[PDB]
Every structure is written in C-alpha cells, then in structure tokens.
Amino acid sequence: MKLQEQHYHEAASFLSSRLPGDAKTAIILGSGLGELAEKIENKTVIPYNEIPHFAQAKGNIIGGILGGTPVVAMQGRFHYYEGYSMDQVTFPIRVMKLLGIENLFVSNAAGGINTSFKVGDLMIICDHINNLPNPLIGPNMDMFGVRFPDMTRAYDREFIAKAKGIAQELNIPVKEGVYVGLTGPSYETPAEYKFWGQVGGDAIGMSTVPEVIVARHTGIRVFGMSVITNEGYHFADDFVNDEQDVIRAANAASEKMGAIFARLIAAV
Amino acid sequence: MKLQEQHYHEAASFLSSRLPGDAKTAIILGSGLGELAEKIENKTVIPYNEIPHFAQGNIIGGILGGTPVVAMQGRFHYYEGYSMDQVTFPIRVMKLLGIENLFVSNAAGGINTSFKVGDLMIICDHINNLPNPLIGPNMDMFGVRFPDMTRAYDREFIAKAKGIAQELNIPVKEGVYVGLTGPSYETPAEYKFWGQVGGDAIGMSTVPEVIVARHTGIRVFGMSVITNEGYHFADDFVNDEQDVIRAANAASEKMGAIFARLIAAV
C-alpha cells in the first residue's frame, strides 16, 4: 500500500537524479526498433539492474536526444511469459509517469492473422484485445489513476494520424489494425490463429497490452506499432515458426519502423 | 481441506445464532438493487468485518414483503485482488444457512445493439472469462467434482420474473452475460468480439457466484442493468464509473420492484 508507493518513488528518484529530465516521451524498444538506441545522441545509460525495484532481467534506461527531441528509452522489456508478475512487467510505466512522461511509444513483433497482413508489413496498432491477465487486478493505486479506467481509444487517434502522415512523407507503406495479446511463449496453433482472426484480430503478439493498460490508467498517451514477422495463415505443409525468423523480420523492419518513431517524437 | 470446512462452518454458526433462520432466499444487492435494503423490515445488520473468515459490507437479515431474506450489501470482486475462494465464500455460507435461492443483480455494458442504457436484462445464460472458482480440491460437502451448467439461470424464476414485469408494466430484456475480470473497461475490439460470439452484456462480477451456487444446488436468478453501450462509439466517448452508477441508481426502483415481487413468488 504505502510500501508500493514508496517503491515507485524510489525508482523514480534514482532515475531523476541521473536523467536529463526534459523527456516527455518514453519509447519501449521492442522488435522493429533494434536500430533506434544507436540513433539516440548524448546518451545517459542506466542499467535496469541498478534501478530500485526494476525486475531482475541488456536492460537499460537510455536518456538522450532522438529526432531532435528529448527521449527516455527502455532497452529491454519484461514479458509475462518469462515468469514476471504483471506488477513487474508494468512497473517501469508507472515510473515513467512519475518522471513526467506524457507519451509512450511502443513496438512489438506480431504474427499476421488477417490475410492482408504479410511478413515485413508495419502495422499501426489501432486497438487491442487483451488475453493476458489484466495488470490492474488488485487494490487500485489512486496515485496513478481511477478504479475503472476507460479504454475506448487506448491508441491515441492524433498520434495515429500523425504517424500516417509521417509514413506518407517518408514513402513507407503502413497498415493499421487490431493487436491481440496472448501470454505465449509457444507460438499459436492454426486453430488459435484462425479463432483470433475470426473475432477481429489482425496480428497476435506476447507483449504490449499490459503496458498499454497501465499507461492509459495513468493518462499517458500511447502509440504502438507491430512488425508483422510471420503469417499465421495459409500454412505450407512443412512450415514452422522460428524465433530466428521472427528476429530476421524484426531486424529487416528496424530501419523503416525506426524512421517513423524517430520523426513522430518531435511531432507529439 | 478440513480447515476449509471448519471455516465455512464457523461463518455459518456466527450468522446462524444472529439471524431468524427461516430465510430461503439470499440476495446480492448489486448495481440496480441500491434501494432494496431500505425496504427490508425487522433488519438484523451484521458487518462483514465481524463475520469469521469473510474477506476484509453487511449481511442484512429481515423480511421483504412478508418473505424472510438474507441480503449481501457489498460484494467482493476478483478485480479487487480477492481470490476466487474469497469472492465466493459467502455463497457457500448461504448454503449452510439453508438458503435455496440466490438472486443477484449487476451492472453490465451492452454489446448487442438491442441492449441500451437503462435496459433491465434478465440473465438467461453466461460466458465465463474469469478464472473458474472451483479450481482446486473439490469440496464434497458442497457438491460434485464436475457440476452441470446447462440451465444455470433457473427457467421457472425467469418465467415468474417476466410475468411480474409484465404485471408491473416494466419492460425487460433477456440475454447472455459475459463475465470478464476487469477492472479496466473493454476496448471496442473486445466488446465487438464478445458480442460476435453471442454475449449481450459484459460485467465484472456474478459469474463466480453463480458457478459456486450451482455447484451446491442453489437456484439462481440474475439481472443486469445495462449501464453503458459498448458499441457505436462517438469520437469522444469515454466509459466512466460515475455514469455507470448513474444508470444503476436510475434502474434501482424498477429493478428492486421486480426482485421484491419475485422473492414473494418463489
């Protein structure tokens, strides 16, 4: 109760004494943003293992300038499939709030479950379906937000419009769709992929949804994109999903996805 | 196992010596029943915090239109951090008191376009998307390992309720309640999904109690106040707890009238 509040304050205080303190946007460097940390100038690098109460995982907080703009980046992320509690997965988001972060940008890798979404496509996330445990289960922390937060437009529409404009300017094709969050860590069966596609999902991944719920609970505006890293449909007789193939697609998308996120930061 | 049994008995004993003892119907005073407790006569009020093993709210014993009732004022939700054992503990205590019928109301978001704000929905079935409350060693004293859920919502109660509503000139809807944990409200994609697969309203309660009631052979009647519409979202629409409560409060007179008459009819 009071201990929980204290833990948030301790992490925030530790980071606040170290970071530039001018960032208003935080970015989770998920799949597809693998080139972005290198682009941050005048880096202050703070290992996760040094920050009070951050889950034991590299993992670094990186402060600096990206796209001409102050940023805080989360290099490394905590996934529910790794055994972290939802409190651990989402702890850094509430720390960002205490630092004065107003906006959260996030990327991830996802399997396409709508046939218009192909390997290598970059999908702006317009909505999600949560099939992981809700991270807000437990006593409400009033310091962060209300008991029953609204999720009608969890993915900020103005950020979406700006990102579409940026993609057009940069001549980068983008798709837009619904992200379905599952725990994993096994990839889905064809029956599962089909089910989620049938009920309106466009891509499926194992992250992001918990952070988005927690961000929205505390009023942070969210922009998210998925790299479509694999196609969960039209399976060849010998098709196998493979982490190295997912990473191949994530790596291949990083330049262009990174260009969008880097241009978006100054626009928000 | 034997300690669990003790705990149920300890809570039941505590209430047993403090309540009249003839009540056959229990009521969870959820959203839409906010005026009913006032109408209970010859009240015995027992705070939850005094009842052995109740999660850390009142039990109200009394007479509602000539009929002895036990009412639960305040309820435990999974989104609060309670275990399912804690959420549903009072239902098993009710069974030990000789309760035969459970009446329950809740607030729910409409996910079928024929369910609108202010509508009173008789629950005819549910879809459970919370953890099943019976996971764990079966409590043989309460029921069997694999309880049937074919007609979890008693058909005779539904018929009676419909007759009562017609008589009182209160329109009612009937439909499927989908239970989710919350506590955040759903996204449009989630609302659309649950509507697509046959849900009519979505809420964050009730399902665990109904599973536990049916496990021990308690007959169930449930209604939802449709407190918000999870469809056709305006560009600036936001869900808001105070607006949900507004609809619950506005529904309380008429919903309470139905429940009060049903209590007398069973």
Added chain:
Amino acid sequence: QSMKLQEQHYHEAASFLSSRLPGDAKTAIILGSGLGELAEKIENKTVIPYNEIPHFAQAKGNIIGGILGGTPVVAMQGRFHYYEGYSMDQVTFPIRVMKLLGIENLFVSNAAGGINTSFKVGDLMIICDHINNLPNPLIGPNMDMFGVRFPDMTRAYDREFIAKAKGIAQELNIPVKEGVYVGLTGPSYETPAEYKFWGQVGGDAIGMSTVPEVIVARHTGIRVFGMSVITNEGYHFADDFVNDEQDVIRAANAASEKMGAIFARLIAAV
C-alpha cells in the same frame, strides 16, 4: 540456481524410473478416458506407483512399462488435471521425465463434449489441432535442456500419426471423426453459451486436459497423437438435460474397446 534445482528434479524422477523400467520404450501413452481397458492389455508389466517416483505430484496413479501391440511402451495410468489445483509444472512434469527416458512419441486420450453437431456421443475423434484456454505451461524461465524459448505449434498433432491412425481405423472397421479440441480449465461443465462460442470459433470438442501435456511434449520435440471420446453433446439441449460425470464415464468406458484397439495397433506403426 533455481534452474539447477529444477533440472535435478527431472533427473531424479528419470533415474528412479530408468533403474526400474525395461528401457526399450519409445512411445508413452497417457491412459485417459477411452483407454480404460488398455493397461490390462499390456504384457509383462512393470508397475511403478506415482507416489514412489521422486517429484511426481501427490494424489491411484502408476507408471506401467511392458509390451503393447507387440511393442515396448510406457503408460501413465492416472493423470493430473489443472482443475484439481496442480500447477502446470506439476501437470506436465511426467512428460519431461518421459523425454529423459528416451520417449519419442506421446499418445494421449481424453473425454470431451461435442460442440460440432457432426460429433455425437460415442464418436471417436482424432485430434488434429487444439485451442488452448488453460494457462500456458511454459510460462516461466525456459528450460534449455528441454527446448527453445518459443516453440512452434503449427502441426502439434503429428500428421503422419493421424494418417496411420485413419488407415488403422479403416482396416479395423472402426469409424472415426477428426477435429479441433478446445482445452478449458473446468471443472464445471460449460454453459450452452460457452459451448456455442467455442463451436462458432472452430472447436469441435471441449475438454479439461491434454493441451498442457501437448505443449510441453512439442517444446521438447516429442511427436503427439491424441483422440477424444465424445462423451456428451454440448448442443441441442433437451429441456431437462443435465451433464453428469456418470454419463461421461459410461460413454468413455463404452468407447474403450475400440479406442484401445486403435492405440494398440498404432504403437507398432510409429
């Protein structure tokens, strides 16, 4: 650290079993519903009670080694269900022990409620795919000794085994169905709305087991064959219909001869 201790537990269970079993089995069978006559068909049995095997979940249950359908086998008589309160680690622990024994193939049966109107009480369904609605058993740090962090599940139910089983069923004149198994936790049976939902999104039968073991088997490269006995129909409910564990058991028992005949012929073919 914690990995060390977990690896040690699997090794302890496997060492205990390997000092006692014949050691020639490549196929293990979970004796679920529909296989209630199969243990008696195993010849030259070595019976090892679960309560003697290091780290097997507490309760009867036995590992049985011997010969079935002319072929070495290890059978799991008794299984652990998530609805009983076991962790997924406990539910699936025996599967990883099988891997350490050199088991390459896992055959599994279960009971399930039909949710496609083509699937009727007493039908024998070859499982061609599943939908998992129980907690994923691999959540937690990955055990590299068993498999990779993100295992593929594209053909969790081996297509070659399915083809062999269909051929066997034809030869033996036993009709079979084929379809998608939906795994739910239970332990309460589903509501009609739930049965309808799962049917709508492509499930053919619903049960409370099997999926966790299949995920863990595939994580460690074990080839899987599964069948469900359709023990009840989760559709077209009569006004007075009730699901009943006793009716499920009767149907499972009634299917056991023909289901067992398929599994016994399949073991030599794989």
